[PDB]
Design a protein around this ligand. Structure first.
Ligand code: HEM
Ligand code: CYN
Length: 137
């Protein structure tokens, strides 16, 4: 279930973080231009970049924290607010986050692993709603 998935993802955090983030940029190429140092690089070129590994680790580390603090796949309003008030995410709309979770849920289904994809779908949707409520457009 959801709680086991957080353990699975944490167990190989860099590998999952990089793969899902890559699935996200490739499915939604417009989102690549938010990350200027990732423009014009192939999957393996990005995986050879130290800063890509580091960034993706930190993102999925935080996502797992929010997921672990969540009750029944609903994240904390203060966790949502953190994402909304952050300098780096100030010029985003909830649409960017929705796309990340589509790519994440798709990835889970296409993998061979027994991920609880429906719980991650709910989690994504509840996070998006919590982002709107905190003032994200
Ligand atoms: C729940 C989902 C997300 C989480 C948990 C998250 C978290 C983070 C964190 C912790 C950082 C700082 C990493 C560091 O210190 O290097 C960061 C950077 C950033 N994120 Fe996100 N993020 C999420 C979704 C998104 C989305 C959907 C976008 C837009 C496509 C986005 C755009 C950015 C940008 C532009 C930066 C700054 C780039 C840089 O470090 O040079 N984030 N994010
Ligand atoms: C943030 N990626």
């Amino acid at each position: 279930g959801f709680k086991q998935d957080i353990a699975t993802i944490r167990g190989d955090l860099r590998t999952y973080a990089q793969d899902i983030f890559l699935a996200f940029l490739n499915k939604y190429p417009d989102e690549r231009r938010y990350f200027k140092n990732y423009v014009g690089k192939s999957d393996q070129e990005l995986k050879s970049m130290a800063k890509f590994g580091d960034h993706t680790e930190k993102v999925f580390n935080l996502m797992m924290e929010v997921a672990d603090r969540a009750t029944d796949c609903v994240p904390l309003a203060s966790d949502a607010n953190t994402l909304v008030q952050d300098k780096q995410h100030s010029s985003l709309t909830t649409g960017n986050f929705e796309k990340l979770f589509v790519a994440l849920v798709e990835y889970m289904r296409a993998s061979g692993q027994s991920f609880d994809s429906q719980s991650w779908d709910r989690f994504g949707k509840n996070l998006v709603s919590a982002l709107s409520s905190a003032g994200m457009k």
